[PDB]
Amino acid sequence: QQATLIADKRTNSLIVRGTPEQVAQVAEL
Amino acid sequence: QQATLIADKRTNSLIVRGTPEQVAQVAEL
């Protein structure tokens, strides 16, 4: 699949949820 | 499934009907 992304507008937080490889890709972006 | 919930407006009563595990979850809420 693809990693789940959750965006909070109040706190300006990005939450990525997936396999450890899919999460390291967002972490470098 | 999920527990059955019955709400009485006249008496403000909540009635939960299900398995003993499903009922203890509403009882703690």
Add this chain to the structure above:
Amino acid sequence: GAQNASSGAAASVKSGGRLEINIPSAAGNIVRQIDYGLNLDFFSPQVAPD
């Protein structure tokens, strides 16, 4: 039910007047508000920990 240009603003302040418009139409009624005087609209106000 009326349409205003500041509906999508996070915060607002106004002082002046306001025109209320109610025109019936077959394609959808024109129901508008036009504000005059001073209009200040603020959109999307993010603040950083700095």
Add this chain to the structure above:
Amino acid sequence: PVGQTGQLVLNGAQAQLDTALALLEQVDRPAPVAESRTVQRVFQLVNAS
């Protein structure tokens, strides 16, 4: 074996007994744990939305 209860009734001469128990002390350790198939990271953005 005492059923499938992780117990094991073993019954032999004492020489065999104190040898098998020294080996089992060496080659017998709990299994490793799986890591996980899902992780979370939270990023507090500063400049972007």
Add this chain to the structure above:
Amino acid sequence: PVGQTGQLVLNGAQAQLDTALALLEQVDRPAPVAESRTVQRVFQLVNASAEEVKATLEGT
């Protein structure tokens, strides 16, 4: 066995009998219990709105 009733009629010499009862005292204990496949937590939010937090977490 007395059917499937968790009873067990065992019948031998007394030497065997007082030996088997000592072993069974050691290697016989009740089974462990499963934990559960479902848990609940309740969070009393202080600064955020519980309904907006739920919509954020569900992507709606």
